[PDB]
Amino acid sequence: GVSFFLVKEKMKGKNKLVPRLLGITKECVMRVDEKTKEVIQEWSLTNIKRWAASPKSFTLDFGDYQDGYYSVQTTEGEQIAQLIAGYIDIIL
């Protein structure tokens, strides 16, 4: 895929928000490192229960696939949501 969103993940360990490349494809969602450009973690679209599209932060609810959800800071939150729903529209 080429559709990647620049998001910032707030994890513990440091107060610095980590720049992440949120790869939204017609088949999966991959977390690519912004500087290393490597894929850390990838999810299937079929594991999407819901998502929260806010103008400052975006949250992906993978349900019972892992502990908690995936929340990242980005102004492209709705763009992400729209794109996921777009790819999902192709499968759905």
């Binding site: 079929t46 594991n47 999407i48 229960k49 819901r50 929260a52 599209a53 806010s54 499968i91």
Partner: peptide, 15 residues
């Protein structure tokens, strides 16, 4: 009754 119309999008391929 707690709605989540805006912000929360309910997808239907969560198997």
């Amino acid at each position: 009754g707690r709605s989540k119309e805006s912000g929360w999008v309910e997808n239907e391929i969560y198997y």
